[PDB]
Design a protein around this ligand. Structure first.
Ligand SMILES: *[C@@H]1O[C@H](CO)[C@@H](O)[C@H](O)[C@H]1NC(C)=O
Ligand SMILES: *[C@@H]1O[C@H](CO)[C@@H](O)[C@H](O)[C@H]1NC(C)=O
Ligand SMILES: *[C@@H]1O[C@H](CO)[C@@H](O)[C@H](O)[C@H]1NC(C)=O
Length: 762
C-alpha cells in the first residue's frame, strides 16, 4: 500500500465522523424499522413519489436513506450512542443492501433529469422513468450526500457489482459536472459548491482516488479565503460573513462554511491536505467574528446568534431548528479542528470562552467595517447595532419567509441581558417598531414586495479602539426617501449616547410622526417607571417624561423630554403567515415603547443592566454631554471624546477646553479635519510627567479615502512626541499637532488606527 496510507487515515476519520449523522433518538426504531421493511427494500409509511409528482422541497423519499444510515451507524459500531449488540449484525447489513438495491435499480438514465428535469424543452419531460425530482438540489447535493454516507459506512462489506456501480454513479454524476452547468442551478458557488465538494470527498474516499480528494480539498480551501471587495460574499477581514449582497449572515451560510471546515480539517490532520496559512487566517477571523455575535440564555445556558446576522430566519420560531435556533456547530469539534492554530491565528481563548457556558464572558467593544456592525459587551449585557450603507442591505423575503422585515439593518439597537428578550416574539411582533430604528410610524405599508433595499450613502461606518466605540450612519430611506437623518451611537462603559441630528421628513409622501423605538421586548417582571411614577400600559398609553425604567434597563432623555407611547400585554400573530412554519398562531406578552421626536434633533442615553441608584446619580450628575454643532456631532464623556465630521464639514472647527474633558485646569483645543471622518480622543492624566497622555483614534466611514487630515490647535499647552517618530505623518511644533496618515486600503478600508502624543500645560 503505497501512499494510500494517507487515504486510509482520512477514510477512517471520515467514516467515524459520518457515523454521527443519525439523531440519537432515531436509534430507538431499529427493530421497528427492520420489521416494517418490505421484501423489495421499501417501507409502507414512506412516500416514494418521483418525477413531476414528488414534493419539490424536502423530498419525503429521503426518510428511506435516513433509516438506512441509522442501520449502518448501528452496524459499524462507530457511533457511541448505538447499542453494542447491533455491531456487525447481518440483519442491518442485509436491510441496507436491499435499500441500496431498490434505489439503484430505479435510478434515472437521462442526464437532463439532473437539473432541467420536468422541462419539455430538454430530454427529461414529465413521465420520464427514474428516481428524480424537479428540484435540481435533489440530484446535485441531497441524494448524493445520503448515498455517499451509506456507501462509506459499508465500504468493507462484500458489495455486489451493481451496488458499487450505483455508489460510484450517484455522486460521480454531480462531481463530473463541477465546472459545468447544473440546469436550474447554473454555476454552483459558495454553499452549493462546498456541499458538492464534500460529497465528492466522500466519493473519493470510497473509490480510493487521491486526485479527486486533492481537487475537492483545493476547491474548498480556496472558497474559504478572504473576501476583500465591498459586498463580496465570503469571510471578510473584520470577521463578518456576507451573502446576498451585503446581508450579514454568519449564522447560516458562514455557519455551514465553518462546519465544512471543521469536518475537513479534523479529517485531514497531519497530511498534505491540511489547510494552509491563508485558510487558517480566514477561519480564525470568522471564529472571532462569530464569538462577538453570540449571546447566552442565562437560564438554559444555550448560546444563540444575534438577530442582525440571521436575515430571513427571524420569522421562524426556535422550534423549527433553523439558523436562529442555536449556534449549530460542535464546540468540541471546533476546538479539535483549531488546536494546531498558532501565532495570530490562535483562537484558543475564543473557544475557552465559548465552551465556558457564560462563566467567561466577552468584554470589550468591536466594530465591523465591511458590514456596518458594532457590538458592545460587558459581563452584564450585550448590545448590537447594524447600520445601512451602500455596502449592506436590510433583509430579504425568500421562500414565503419573512415579508415584514423592511426596517431591519436600518439602525437597530438590540440588548441582551437575560438572553430571551426577543426569543420567538416575532410572531405577535409589531414589525413597524424595530428596536433602535428611527422610522416613520407604520410607513411604508409593510408587505412582501417591500423588504430588501441597499443604502444610498457611503458615510456609514464606525471608529473604535477596543474599549470605546462610535458608529455613524448617514441615513436616507431607501424605498422612497420619505425620511432622512444623521444618527450616531457612542459606546463607552455601561452607557450608550444616541444623538439623532438633521431630521428630514418628506411631508408630500406621508405625514407620519418621526419616532425612535427604544425597545420592543417580551414582558419582564417589574413595572413601567416614568419620572418615578408607575404607568399602567395595559392599553396603548402616551406620556411624557425624562426617564424610563423597565426590565432592568434605563432610558434617560437630555433636555427635551420623551414623548412616549407605551404598551404591555398580549399580542397575537400567525407563524404560518410569515414563513413556511406550521406552528399556527401564538400569543406572547410584549412590552413596546417608542418616543415621538421633535422636529430637528433629539438625544438620549441608554443604561443596560442598571438600577434606580445609577440613574439617579446620572440625572443628578451626568457623565455624558451630547453636542450638536454645524454638521458635527460630538460626545463629551468621562471615558473620552467622540467626534463626528459629517459630510459638508470641510474646514469647520470644534473647540473644547481641557477642563471640560478632565485633562487640565486651563487650556483649550481647536480641532479641524480636512475630509469627513470619525475620531476618538481619549486622555489619560499623568502626574509623574505632569501632563496628559492623549490617544487619537481615526477611521474612514466611506472606505474610499486613502489619507487623513487630522489637525489640533492648542492654547496654553505644548505637544511632545513620546516615541520621537514622525514616521506616522506626525508634525509636532510648539503647540500644533497635525496628523497626515495613510488610511488602510483593500480589505481593511474602514478600520481604525490609533496614535499617541503627550501634552504639557504651559
Ligand atoms: C439488542 O437489540 C435489540 C433490537 O433493538 C434490542 O431490543 C435489545 O435491547 C438489544 N440488547 C442490548 C443488550 O442492547
Ligand atoms: C481519479 O479521478 C480523475 C478525475 O475524474 C481521473 O482523471 C483519474 O483517472 C481517477 N483515477 C483513478 C485511479 O481512477
Ligand atoms: C459534540 O458532540 C459530542 C459527541 O456527539 C457530544 O457529546 C457533545 O455534547 C457535542 N457538543 C455540543 C456543544 O453539542
Amino acid at each position: 500500500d503505497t501512499d494510500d496510507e494517507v487515504l486510509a487515515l482520512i477514510t477512517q476519520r471520515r467514516t467515524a465522523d459520518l457515523a454521527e449523522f443519525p439523531n440519537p433518538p432515531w436509534f430507538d426504531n431499529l427493530q421497528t424499522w427492520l420489521d416494517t421493511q418490505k421484501e423489495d427494500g421499501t417501507w409502507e409509511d414512506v412516500i416514494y413519489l418521483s418525477g413531476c409528482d414528488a414534493r419539490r422541497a424536502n423530498w419525503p423519499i429521503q426518510e428511506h436513506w435516513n433509516r438506512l444510515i441509522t442501520f449502518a451507524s448501528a452496524w459499524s459500531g462507530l457511533n457511541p450512542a448505538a447499542p453494542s449488540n447491533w455491531t456487525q449484525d447481518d440483519r442491518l447489513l442485509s436491510a441496507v443492501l436491499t435499500g441500496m438495491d431498490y434505489w439503484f435499480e430505479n435510478d434515472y438514465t437521462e442526464s437532463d433529469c439532473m437539473g432541467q428535469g420536468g422541462e419539455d424543452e430538454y430530454n427529461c419531460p414529465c413521465g420520464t422513468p427514474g428516481l428524480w425530482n424537479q428540484n435540481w438540489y435533489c440530484q446535485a447535493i441531497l441524494i448524493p450526500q445520503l448515498v455517499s454516507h451509506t456507501c462509506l459506512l459499508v465500504k468493507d462489506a462484500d458489495l455486489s457489482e451493481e451496488q458499487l456501480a450505483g455508489c460510484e454513479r450517484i455522486p460521480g454524476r454531480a462531481y463530473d459536472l463541477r465546472d459545468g452547468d447544473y440546469g436550474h442551478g447554473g454555476d454552483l458557488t459558495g454553499s452549493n459548491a462546498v456541499n458538492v465538494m464534500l460529497n465528492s470527498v466522500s466519493l473519493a474516499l470510497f473509490v480510493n482516488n487521491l486526485t479527486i480528494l486533492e481537487d475537492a480539498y483545493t476547491r474548498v480551501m480556496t472558497l474559504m479565503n478572504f473576501a476583500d471587495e465591498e459586498m463580496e460574499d465570503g469571510i471578510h477581514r473584520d470577521g463578518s460573513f456576507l451573502q446576498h449582497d451585503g446581508i450579514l449572515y454568519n449564522s447560516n451560510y458562514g455557519k455551514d462554511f465553518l462546519n465544512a471546515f471543521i469536518q475537513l480539517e479534523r479529517q485531514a490532520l497531519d497530511t498534505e491536505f491540511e489547510a494552509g496559512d491563508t485558510t487558517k487566517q480566514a477561519i480564525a477571523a470568522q471564529v472571532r467574528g462569530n464569538e462577538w455575535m453570540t449571546f447566552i440564555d442565562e437560564e438554559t445556558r444555550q448560546q444563540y446568534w444575534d438577530f442582525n446576522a440571521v436575515g430571513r430566519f427571524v420569522s421562524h420560531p426556535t422550534s423549527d431548528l433553523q439558523a436562529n435556533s442555536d449556534i449549530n456547530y460542535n464546540l468540541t469539534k471546533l476546538a479539535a479542528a483549531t488546536a494546531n492554530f498558532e501565532g495570530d491565528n490562535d483562537v484558543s481563548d475564543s473557544l475557552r470562552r465559548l465552551m465556558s457556558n457564560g462563566t467567561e464572558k466577552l468584554h470589550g467593544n468591536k466594530g465591523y467595517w465591511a458590514s456596518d456592525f458594532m457590538v458592545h459587551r460587558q459581563d452584564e449585557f450585550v448590545v448590537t447595532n447594524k447600520m445601512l450603507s451602500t455596502r449592506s442591505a436590510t433583509s430579504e423575503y425568500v421562500n414565503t419567509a419573512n415579508p415584514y422585515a423592511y426596517h431591519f439593518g436600518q439602525g437597530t439597537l438590540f440588548c441582551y441581558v437575560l438572553g430571551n428578550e426577543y426569543k420567538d416574539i416575532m410572531g405577535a411582533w409589531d414589525w413597524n417598531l424595530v428596536p433602535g430604528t428611527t422610522v416613520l410610524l407604520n410607513h411604508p405599508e409593510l408587505q412582501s414586495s417591500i423588504v430588501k433595499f441597499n443604502g444610498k450613502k457611503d458615510f456609514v461606518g464606525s471608529v473604535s479602539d477596543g474599549t470605546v466605540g462610535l458608529s455613524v450612519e448617514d441615513y436616507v430611506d431607501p424605498y422612497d426617501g420619505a425620511i432622512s437623518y444623521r444618527k450616531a451611537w457612542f459606546f463607552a462603559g455601561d452607557s450608550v449616547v444616541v444623538i439623532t441630528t438633521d431630521i428630514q421628513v418628506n411631508s408630500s409622501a406621508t405625514t407620519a410622526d418621526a419616532i425612535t423605538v427604544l425597545d420592543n421586548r417580551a414582558s419582564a417582571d417589574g413595572d413601567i417607571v416614568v419620572d418615578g411614577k408607575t404607568v399602567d400600559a395595559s392599553t396603548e398609553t402616551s406620556i411624557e417624561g425624562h426617564s424610563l425604567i423597565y426590565g432592568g434597563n434605563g432610558y434617560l432623555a437630555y433636555q427635551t423630554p420623551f414623548n412616549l407611547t407605551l404598551f404591555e400585554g398580549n399580542r397575537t400573530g400567525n407563524w404560518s403567515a410569515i414563513s413556511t412554519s406550521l406552528e399556527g398562531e401564538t400569543t406572547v406578552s410584549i412590552f413596546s415603547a417608542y418616543t415621538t421626536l421633535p422636529k430637528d434633533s433629539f438625544s438620549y442615553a441608554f443604561f443596560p443592566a442598571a438600577d434606580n441608584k445609577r440613574l439617579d446619580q446620572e440625572m443628578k450628575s451626568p457623565t455624558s454631554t451630547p453636542i450638536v454643532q454645524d454638521n458635527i456631532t460630538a460626545v463629551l464623556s468621562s471615558h473620552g471624546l467622540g467626534l463626528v465630521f459629517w459630510p459638508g464639514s470641510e474646514g469647520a472647527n470644534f473647540t473644547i477646553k481641557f477642563a471640560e474633558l478632565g485633562w487640565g485646569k486651563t487650556g483649550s483645543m481647536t480641532i479641524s479635519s480636512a475630509q469627513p471622518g470619525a475620531y476618538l480622543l481619549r486622555g489619560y492624566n499623568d502626574s509623574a510627567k505632569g501632563g496628559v497622555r492623549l490617544v487619537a483614534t481615526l477611521s474612514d466611514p466611506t472606505q474610499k479615502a486613502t489619507s487623513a487630515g487630522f489637525s489640533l490647535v492648542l492654547q496654553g499647552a505644548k505637544v511632545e512626541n513620546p516615541y520621537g517618530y514622525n514616521d506616522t505623518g506626525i508634525i509636532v511644533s510648539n503647540n500644533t499637532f497635525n496628523l497626515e496618515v495613510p488610511l488602510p486600503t483593500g480589505g481593511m478600508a474602514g478600520s481604525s488606527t490609533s496614535y499617541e502624543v503627550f501634552l504639557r500645560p504651559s
